[PDB]
């Protein structure tokens, strides 16, 4: 049953945003304030999205794609700011991201596997672009920061590249591809990916000192 | 009849944007330019929104929520810039705001009062968050500005906290709550709130000297 | 037949984004990076939009307006950054732009010519506002830049004011106005306008030295 997977997701996202809110209450360093604000909004949004999916009962799920659409940009912003990335490259990441999600929604809404295949390819190309920049460009840029920031980025980088790559694969084994995995399980896996990519990521970032200004 | 309430709203928003446009024509100070641009766009958008509601004849009103969705962020930006608020806190205000409106639209589109109640609660929590930051954080921040800017902010702060709080209450006495107030009146009250919160706010801000750079 | 007009558009937008991507691969100057990122995203988005129109077969076209909605803002950003335009004026351009497109979509979705006429007027007023600022304000601002940047802007300015003005006229001879031009031709003309206003504009900008920082 999906309701219990959607119930838990709603819970963990809600708990994570609450916890993030508590830990950030007494933060004066403006650098940290941005990270807290950015990072707390991500899971705050997924929260409302999962709640709508939970109350939704009574395939295709717009809430699932809207969540991704609004939250992925903030996630990259976190990484961007952490490494003091250039505005152009930041703008390129978000645009590529917006394309990755929008394009993936069209595929989901398409019937002809052939067509869906094209949308899937464009989406994955967009994701690979984003990951490429995260793994390489950002790592080099992160090399000019104090070790504390460099190492925190590396962890977030690894977790992000890995977790993000699993989405199209989970999407592939679901109903839009090799129909191996039933709906409830598909919902579960995406839930695990969503909590980890948002709350997991947030814990890693908001617990480190990296969110604090340097010199 | 709602048409005459929707007709007036269209008129006042249109007149306000026209007036704002005239007063800003000869402005060189870049600080003032931002305030004029920001402030003039708010009522320019509501204008087109009310016009669609007026021509719409021939409940539920998407134009009403889209107006709020696009304009509330700019309104907070005005206050944010006036007090030189931090980027993180600005980003947190807009996100909370986006959540407040989106969440309120889902409630409006929900049938089960129970469900609608939850959406209402999340929305009001988001608004209270925004107001909390406006009344306290911004006031402290406003304390570091010349008296002219400090006092103009206080007025906008008061008018905003008061006017904004009336929305959920008006929403409550309408058809989604205690069905005490009929449709035409509901439309009227929201119109009065919209004109005051946009044109009223604009007059207060664009007439003061606060919009001008300091040192 | 529209498919071949929509097929070519998909091709030219795709080729342009590919070419833009190649030329920008080895760019370190952050000034140039922004221009490449901004400029490459515009045609990358139109690409996916035209592809959906092409695969769409199997009037009214949302993809056509969404393309414009998401891409016109970036186009103005290019011009804005090139002339180091003020934030307020940038914010005013995008808002006016968002209004121009949204308002034009409502007109297209309206049946009563009379109503459609009003939407058309508001949209054209918004465009004239944008052009007015581009031709005058930006030109003056461009006068404070080295001749290389001044002259590149002038060309983009001319091409933009001319190409953009042709849209409402093409819209006028189509089915929402003087039904002189059939659908396939209408689609063709808009395609020519889209490729020129995006790829054409991009070639002009990304080939010049203007995208490089100065002092
Ligand atoms: C049902 C639940 C499980 C789910 C929760 C429901 C939830 C969706 C409703 C809450 C609204 C939610 C959208 C708010 C998001 C807030 C988040 C973006 C804040 C990030 O934090 C940013 C800082 C800005 O710092 P400043 O400039 O010094 O002021 O917030 C300001 C810091 C303040 C000093 C402290 C504020 C404390 C709070 C008012 C409490
Ligand atoms: C039916 C009516 C009741 C309703 C009105 C219809 C209306 C919706 C259509 C108009 C389009 C509207 C969307 C435009 C909004 C403009 C607003 C954001 C401008 C704010 O103002 C910003 C400044 C930027 O200053 P700069 O950089 O020095 O140049 O505008 C530039 C200042 C210029 C120097 C002066 C410009 C004057 C105008 C061209 C007139
Ligand atoms: C079917 C086809 C005809 C259509 C194409 C399909 C297409 C839609 C799918 C691709 C995804 C597309 C959305 C990506 C847009 C990218 C564009 C915004 C990039 C602009 O370029 C910005 C720079 C940022 O520079 P940096 O900070 O030094 O790093 O990109 C980083 C520069 C890097 C150093 C070089 C990157 C090279 C690429 C990975 C190749
Ligand atoms: C979107 C909704 O999807 C529904 C389909 C129905 O079949 O129609 C509507 C289909 C869409 C028009 C299909 C094309 C989608 C593109 C991949 C969207 C790129 C989106 C980014 C959000 C652009 C960033 C813009 C920024 C500058 C404001
Ligand atoms: C929205 C339209 O509402 C219609 C419902 C129909 O029942 O479906 C669609 C329902 C929605 C998916 C419900 C969830 C709404 C949330 C409260 C939206 C948060 C929105 C802010 C705009 C997020 C800011 C994102 C930024 C980073 C670009
Ligand atoms: C939009 C979709 O159009 C469909 C109509 C159906 O008849 O309904 C929906 C109709 C719309 C509500 C009509 C009004 C449209 C305005 C002209 C929109 C101004 C839009 C800019 C995007 C605002 C910039 C906001 C920024 C601050 C985030
Ligand atoms: C909080 C949510 C996160 C981090 C979501 C990330 C999502 C992706 C990387 C999704 C990618 C997809 C493709 C590459 C193609 C197939 C469809 C998608 C949308 C699942
Ligand atoms: C120009 C429009 C303005 C200033 C609108 C402000 C709107 C709000 C503060 C709306 C709040 C609502 C709730 C808190 C819950 C119930 C539903 C809403 C959307 C009316
Ligand atoms: C890449 C696309 C570009 C540059 C599109 C530009 C579009 C316009 C200037 C459209 C204007 C319109 C009006 C002024 C009124 C009638 C309807 C429109 C949307 C065609």
The string of DSSP letters for A135-168 reads: IIIHHHHHTTS-HHHHHHHHHHHHHHHHHHHHHH
Closest C-alpha among A60, A37, A63 to residue A51: A63
Q: Is the CB of A52 under 6 A from ligand 5?
A: yes
Number of domains within chain B: 1
CA distance linking residue B28 with residue B25, whole number of Å: 9
Ligand whose nearest atom lies closest to the CA of A52 = 5
CB neighbours (10 Å) of residue C182? 12
**C-alpha torsion angle, residues C85, C90, C92, C96 (rounded to 10):** 120
CA distance linking residue C32 with residue A88, whole number of Å: 8
Q: What is the resolution of this structure in A?
A: 2.3
CA distance linking residue B27 with residue C96, whole number of Å: 18
Q: Is the dihedral of CA C187, C188, C189, C194 positive or negative?
A: positive
CB neighbours (10 Å) of residue A29? 13
Closest C-alpha among A94, A90, A76 to residue A160: A76
User: Which residue numbers come right before each break in chain B (C to N over 2.5 Å)?
Assistant: 58
Give A73's Cβ-side CA count (13 Å radius): 18
- Is A67 in contact with A38 (CB distance < 8 Å)? no
CA distance linking residue A125 with residue A120, whole number of Å: 8
**What 8-state DSSP symbol labels residue A179?**
T
With contact defined as 3+ CB pairs under 8 Å, the chains touching C are A, B
Q: How far is the CA of A143 from the centre of ligand 8 (A)?
A: 46
Q: Which two tokens stand for residue B50?
A: 């009310």
Q: Which two tokens stand for residue A48?
A: 């409302």
- Is A35 in contact with A71 (CB distance < 8 Å)? no
Closest C-alpha among C152, C130, C127 to residue C142: C152
**Which residues from C are below 8 Å from A87, CB to CB?**
30, 34
Q: How far does CA C34 lie from the centroid of its chain?
A: 17
Q: Is the dihedral of CA A53, A101, A207, B141 positive or negative?
A: negative
Cα radius of gyration rounded to whole Å, chain A: 17
Q: How many helices (H) and strands (E) does chain B have?
A: 9, 0
DSSP C54-92: HHT-----HHHHHHHHHHHHHHHHHHHHHTT--HHHHHH
Q: Which two tokens stand for residue B104?
A: 């309120």
| DSSP H stretches of helix in chain A | 3-24, 30-55, 62-82, 87-108, 113-132, 138-142, 147-173, 183-195, 201-207
Which residues are CB-contacts of B179 (< 8 A; sequence separation ≥ 6)? none
Distance from CA of A67 to the nearest CA of B (A): 12
Which residues are CB-contacts of B152 (< 8 A; sequence separation ≥ 6)? B82, B204, B205, B208, B209, B210
Distances (CA, A) of B124 to A13, A22, B95, C125: 19, 19, 14, 38
Which residues are CB-contacts of C156 (< 8 A; sequence separation ≥ 6)? C78, C79, C82, C201, C204, C205
Q: Which two tokens stand for residue B210?
A: 């606060």
C-alpha angle A51/A56/A62, rounded to 5°?
85
Q: What are phi and psi of A162, to 5 degrees?
A: -70, -55
Closest C-alpha among B59, C126, A99, A69 to residue A61: A69
Q: How far is the CA of B51 from the centre of ligand 9 (A)?
A: 20
Q: Which two tokens stand for residue C84?
A: 């180091």
CA distance linking residue A55 with residue C22, whole number of Å: 47
Size of interface B-C (CB pairs under 8 A): 38
Size of interface A-B (CB pairs under 8 A): 38
Q: Which atom of ligand 1 is nearest to the CA of B92?
A: 18
Q: Which two tokens stand for residue B77?
A: 């930006």
Method used to solve the structure:
X-ray
CATH, residue B8: 1.20.1070.10
3-class secondary structure, A25: coil
Q: Do A44 and B99 touch (CB under 8 A)?
A: yes
Q: Is the CB of C177 under 6 A from ligand 9?
A: no
Q: How far does CA B171 lie from the centroid of its chain?
A: 15
Cα radius of gyration rounded to whole Å, chain C: 17
CA distance linking residue C176 with residue B101, whole number of Å: 34
- For ligand 5, atom 4, which residue shows the shortest CA distance? B106
Cα radius of gyration rounded to whole Å, chain B: 17
3-class secondary structure, C104: helix
Q: Is the dihedral of CA B58, B61, B63, B64 positive or negative?
A: positive
- Is B108 in contact with B161 (CB distance < 8 Å)? no
Which residues are CB-contacts of C71 (< 8 A; sequence separation ≥ 6)? C42, C45, C46, C198
Q: What are phi and psi of C181, to 5 degrees?
A: -95, 130
Q: Do B86 and A36 touch (CB under 8 A)?
A: no
Q: Which H/E stretch holds residue B25?
A: none
Q: Do C48 and A122 touch (CB under 8 A)?
A: yes
3-class secondary structure, B82: helix
Q: How many residues does chain B have?
A: 215
Q: Which two tokens stand for residue A123?
A: 């989406």
Domain membership of residue C9 as a residue range: 1-215
A75 at interface of B, judged by CB pairs closer than 8 A: no
- For ligand 9, atom 2, which residue shows the shortest CA distance? C68
Distance, first Cα to last Cα, chain B: 52
Q: How far is the CA of A21 from the centre of ligand 1 (A)?
A: 6
Q: Which H/E stretch holds residue C156?
A: helix C147-173
Angle between helices A87-108 and C30-55 (to 10 degrees): 10
- Is C112 in contact with C123 (CB distance < 8 Å)? no
CA distance linking residue A180 with residue A147, whole number of Å: 44
Nearest residue of chain A to residue B91 (CA atoms): A37
């Amino acid at each position: 049953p999906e309701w219990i997977w959607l119930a838990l997701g709603t819970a963990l996202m809600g708990l994570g945003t609450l916890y993030f809110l508590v830990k950030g209450m007494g933060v004066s360093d403006p650098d940290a304030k941005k990270f807290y604000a950015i990072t707390t909004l991500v899971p705050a949004i997924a929260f409302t999205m999962y709640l709508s999916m939970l109350l939704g009962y009574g395939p295709i799920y717009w809430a699932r794609y809207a969540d991704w659409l609004f939250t992925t940009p903030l996630l990259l912003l976190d990484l961007a700011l952490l490494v003091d990335a250039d505005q152009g490259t930041i703008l390129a990441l978000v645009g590529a991201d917006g394309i990755m999600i929008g394009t993936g929604l069209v595929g989901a809404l398409t019937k002809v596997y052939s067509y869906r295949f094209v949308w899937w390819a464009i989406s994955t190309a967009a994701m690979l672009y984003i990951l490429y920049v995260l793994f390489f460009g950002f790592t080099s840029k992160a090399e000019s920061m104090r070790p504390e920031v460099a190492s925190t980025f590396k962890v977030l980088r690894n977790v992000t590249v890995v977790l993000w790559s699993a989405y199209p694969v989970v999407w592939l084994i679901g109903s839009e591809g090799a129909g191996i995995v039933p709906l409830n399980i598909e919902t579960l896996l995406f839930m695990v990916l969503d909590v980890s990519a948002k709350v997991g990521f947030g814990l890693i970032l908001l617990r480190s000192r990296a969110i604090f200004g340097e010199a």
